[PDB]
Write a protein that binds this ligand. Structure first.
Ligand code: TK1
Ligand code: GLC
Ligand code: NA
Length: 446
């Protein structure tokens, strides 16, 4: 029975409360000196602090590295009503070559600095020496707002000899070893951090950032006294939970399915990022693919016959998941996806594939809701407030564009967060505006 195979994806409320409590426990472990180093949830102080210690105005360069495409953009920051407006003015996107991303650090950052030029020249501006904000969507141990070493690549990145190294250095070398231009690199932030920062003008309650895109992560404003790895008890600092690695010490073992185990084993980073592998768009289409393969090996789908493409890793794209679940019921979208994959599905084949899609994506919404509710309830407790009103800034294609993910996600987080009133804001150019606003504050020292 297909329903019996799909039922393995369900999570009961008690399963979610369990996931939630365990996440809260790992978050606490990551923050404490005695456990931070062994912690699966690393809880990385980011050096982004509360209060407006003045902001510079003008134009800022923003880099965005964290997918196969790299982005360079210009953001103009200025003074006003609530404070500082920000707006992307010029933007250019760049694909990284196959052998550039598998090259070396020094090399990849050369392709990156090269790309900064194709943008600088192509916009009448190689002569400018701009402040630079770098959104870099990989786990970094910060020493400061402008200094921090990459702990490891995630999401299938692999450039050699980049791990263990100050990432801002690597970038300032490619800037020297280019002669071309001069840029001052003032801040490196995680994408979660940028997204939250980008909503803060519109909403001063925005103190969490969450990405549900290719990967899955969040950050939030922690009490400085709770942040044991930075001296000081005063104010708040932003903590990059890196919750993607929740489960890398076995915390999700009772939930993982044969599909999860296979995605993990054939991944670039086996044994790591296990929570993220349940949720992120890098993995969601692959999960459905494996579920489809299981259904077929059992003769419950495509009369037990799978195409060449269907048996290939990566072929069931995450965007297909989202398109399958947008089908209006006439099966046209489903049929056209499958047919392109060299399949000839029946009416019941289409409906099964839809069901497989719903199961994978519902489980990602719910699994993700437990992570966030854990963050929100911790913060409600830390701040000692009765009804906590909080805004979460959110970005990522899974959340923004999968037709039912956001609604299932919001319903499930609200269920797990009594006495919290959560406002969700989808960020508008969160990466670039976010890196720009941090930059503009980091430009009060210099
Ligand atoms: C004027 S305004 O009110 O429109 C306005 C003000 C700030 C804005 O972004 C920020 C930039 C920052 N740069 C640093 C930094 C940088 C270096 C060292 C230490 N700190 N910290 C920052 C905090 C924020 C805002 N911030 C919070 O305070 C809680 C959640 C959040 O996003 C956005 C709009
Ligand atoms: O892009 C979302 C997330 O992807 C992975 O989880 C990265 O390790 C993390 O830094 C990033 O925030
Ligand atoms: Na502290």
């Amino acid at each position: 029975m297909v329903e019996q195979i799909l039922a393995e994806f369900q999570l009961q409320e008690e399963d979610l409360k369990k996931v939630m409590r365990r996440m809260q426990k790992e978050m606490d472990r990551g923050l404490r000196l005695e456990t931070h180093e062994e912690a699966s949830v690393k809880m990385l102080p980011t050096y982004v602090r509360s209060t407006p210690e003045g902001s510079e105005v003008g134009d800022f360069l923003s880099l965005d590295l964290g997918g196969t495409n790299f982005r360079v953009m210009l953001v103009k920051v200025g003074e006003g009503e609530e404070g500082q407006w920000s707006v992307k003015t010029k933007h250019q996107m760049y694909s990284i070559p196959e052998d550039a991303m598998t090259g070396t650090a020094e090399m990849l950052f050369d392709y990156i600095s090269e790309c900064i030029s194709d943008f600088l020249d192509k916009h009448q501006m190689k002569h400018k020496k701009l402040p630079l904000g770098f959104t870099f969507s990989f786990p970094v141990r910060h020493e400061d707002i402008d200094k921090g070493i990459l702990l490891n690549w995630t999401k299938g990145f692999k450039a050699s000899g980049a791990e263990g190294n100050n990432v801002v250095g690597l970038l300032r070398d490619a800037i020297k070893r280019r002669g071309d231009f001069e840029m001052d690199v003032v801040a490196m932030v995680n994408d979660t951090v940028a997204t939250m920062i980008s909503c803060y003008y519109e909403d001063h309650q925005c103190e969490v950032g969450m990405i549900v895109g290719t990967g899955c992560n969040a950050c939030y404003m922690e009490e400085m006294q709770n942040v044991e790895l930075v001296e000081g008890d005063e104010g708040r600092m932003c903590v990059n939970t890196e919750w993607g690695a929740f489960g890398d010490s076995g915390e999700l073992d009772e939930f993982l399915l044969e599909y999860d185990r296979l995605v993990d084993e054939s991944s670039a980073n086996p044994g790591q990022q296990l929570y993220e592998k349940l949720i992120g768009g890098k993995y969601m289409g692959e999960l459905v693919r494996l579920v489809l393969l299981r259904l077929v090996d059992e003769n419950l789908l495509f009369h037990g016959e799978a195409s060449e493409q269907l048996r290939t890793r990566g072929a069931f794209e995450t965007r297909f998941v989202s398109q399958v679940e947008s089908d209006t019921g006439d099966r046209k979208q489903i049929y056209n996806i499958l047919s392109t994959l060299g399949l000839r599905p029946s009416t019941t084949d289409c409906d099964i594939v839809r069901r497989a899609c719903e199961s994978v994506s519902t489980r990602a919404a719910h699994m993700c809701s437990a992570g966030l509710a854990g963050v929100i309830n911790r913060m409600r407790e830390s701040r000692s407030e009765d009804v906590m009103r909080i805004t979460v800034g959110v970005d990522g294609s899974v959340y923004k564009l999968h037709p039912s993910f956001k609604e299932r996600f919001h319903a499930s987080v609200r269920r797990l967060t009594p006495s919290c009133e959560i406002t969700f804001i989808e960020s508008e150019e969160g990466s670039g505006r976010g890196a720009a606003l941090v930059s503009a504050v980091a430009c009060k020292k210099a």
